Design a protein around this motif. Structure first.
Motif, short mmCIF file in Angstrom:
data_model
loop_
_atom_site.label_atom_id
_atom_site.label_comp_id
_atom_site.label_asym_id
_atom_site.label_seq_id
_atom_site.Cartn_x
_atom_site.Cartn_y
_atom_site.Cartn_z
N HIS A 166 -4.44 18.38 -18.39
CA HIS A 166 -3.57 18.08 -19.51
C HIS A 166 -2.56 19.22 -19.76
N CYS A 167 -3.05 20.45 -19.71
CA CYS A 167 -2.21 21.61 -19.90
C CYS A 167 -1.14 21.67 -18.83
N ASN A 168 -1.54 21.44 -17.58
CA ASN A 168 -0.53 21.41 -16.51
C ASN A 168 0.54 20.30 -16.71
N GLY A 169 0.12 19.13 -17.20
CA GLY A 169 1.05 18.07 -17.55
C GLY A 169 2.06 18.50 -18.59
N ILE A 170 1.55 19.13 -19.64
CA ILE A 170 2.43 19.73 -20.67
C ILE A 170 3.44 20.70 -20.05
N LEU A 171 2.94 21.63 -19.24
CA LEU A 171 3.78 22.62 -18.58
C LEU A 171 4.89 21.93 -17.79
N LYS A 172 4.54 20.93 -16.97
CA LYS A 172 5.51 20.18 -16.18
C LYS A 172 6.55 19.54 -17.10
N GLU A 173 6.09 18.98 -18.20
CA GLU A 173 7.05 18.41 -19.18
C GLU A 173 7.97 19.46 -19.80
N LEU A 174 7.45 20.62 -20.14
CA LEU A 174 8.28 21.65 -20.76
C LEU A 174 9.38 22.13 -19.78
N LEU A 175 9.06 22.06 -18.48
CA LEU A 175 9.97 22.46 -17.40
C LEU A 175 10.88 21.31 -16.93
N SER A 176 10.72 20.08 -17.45
CA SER A 176 11.39 18.91 -16.94
C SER A 176 12.83 18.79 -17.46
N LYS A 177 13.63 17.96 -16.79
CA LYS A 177 15.03 17.79 -17.21
C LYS A 177 15.13 17.21 -18.61
N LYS A 178 14.14 16.41 -19.03
CA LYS A 178 14.10 15.83 -20.36
C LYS A 178 14.41 16.87 -21.49
N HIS A 179 13.89 18.06 -21.31
CA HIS A 179 13.93 19.09 -22.37
C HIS A 179 14.79 20.27 -22.01
N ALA A 180 15.51 20.19 -20.90
CA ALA A 180 16.25 21.34 -20.39
C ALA A 180 17.30 21.90 -21.35
N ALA A 181 17.89 21.05 -22.20
CA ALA A 181 18.96 21.56 -23.07
C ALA A 181 18.50 22.65 -24.03
N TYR A 182 17.22 22.62 -24.43
CA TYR A 182 16.65 23.62 -25.31
C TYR A 182 15.57 24.46 -24.62
N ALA A 183 15.03 24.00 -23.51
CA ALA A 183 13.97 24.77 -22.85
C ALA A 183 14.47 25.91 -21.97
N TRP A 184 15.71 25.84 -21.52
CA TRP A 184 16.18 26.76 -20.45
C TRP A 184 16.03 28.27 -20.72
N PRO A 185 16.20 28.73 -21.98
CA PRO A 185 16.02 30.18 -22.21
C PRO A 185 14.60 30.65 -21.96
N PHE A 186 13.65 29.72 -21.93
CA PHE A 186 12.22 30.00 -21.72
C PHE A 186 11.76 29.88 -20.29
N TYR A 187 12.67 29.58 -19.37
CA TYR A 187 12.29 29.34 -17.99
C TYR A 187 11.90 30.59 -17.23
N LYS A 188 12.48 31.72 -17.59
CA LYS A 188 12.26 32.97 -16.87
C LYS A 188 12.09 34.12 -17.86
N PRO A 189 11.55 35.27 -17.42
CA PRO A 189 11.43 36.39 -18.38
C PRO A 189 12.76 36.76 -19.00
N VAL A 190 12.72 37.14 -20.27
CA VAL A 190 13.88 37.68 -20.92
C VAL A 190 14.33 38.90 -20.14
N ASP A 191 15.60 38.88 -19.74
CA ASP A 191 16.15 40.02 -19.00
C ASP A 191 16.90 40.91 -20.00
N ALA A 192 16.14 41.74 -20.70
CA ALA A 192 16.67 42.48 -21.83
C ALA A 192 17.87 43.36 -21.46
N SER A 193 17.76 44.08 -20.34
CA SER A 193 18.87 44.95 -19.94
C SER A 193 20.12 44.13 -19.64
#
Length: 110
Positions: free
Chosen positions: A7-34
């Protein structure tokens, strides 16, 4: 449960899916602070977290239970709420993605 981790993996796949990309994208990779000029980010955030790190942990069988997985996903959102002014676009994006997460996490098989 293995079942709960699926179930958790399903959630993860959904959070990474195109459905939610407009708001999910900043969370895709580590914050590159520098790169972003956020030279205080690592003084304020003790434990950085992002979806690519959650995905690597899932793939490596690091999570032993659903609660451990949820704690990382919530850690990611909490870092966003801790660091940023509450009117920042990224915080609005976090709130929307967290809504997706929490409603589906709540439907965990038990």
């Amino acid at each position: 449960l293995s079942e709960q981790l699926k179930h958790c993996n399903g959630i993860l796949k959904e959070l990474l899916s195109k459905k939610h990309a407009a708001y999910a994208w900043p969370f895709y990779k580590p914050v590159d602070a520098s790169a972003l000029g956020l030279h205080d980010y690592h003084d304020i955030i003790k434990h950085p977290m992002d979806l690519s790190t959650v995905k690597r942990k899932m793939e490596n069988r690091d999570y032993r239970d659903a609660q451990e997985f949820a704690a990382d996903v919530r850690l990611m959102f909490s870092n966003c709420y801790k660091y940023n002014p509450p009117d920042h676009d990224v915080v609005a994006m976090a709130r929307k993605l967290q809504d997706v997460f929490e409603f589906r996490y709540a439907k965990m098989p038990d």
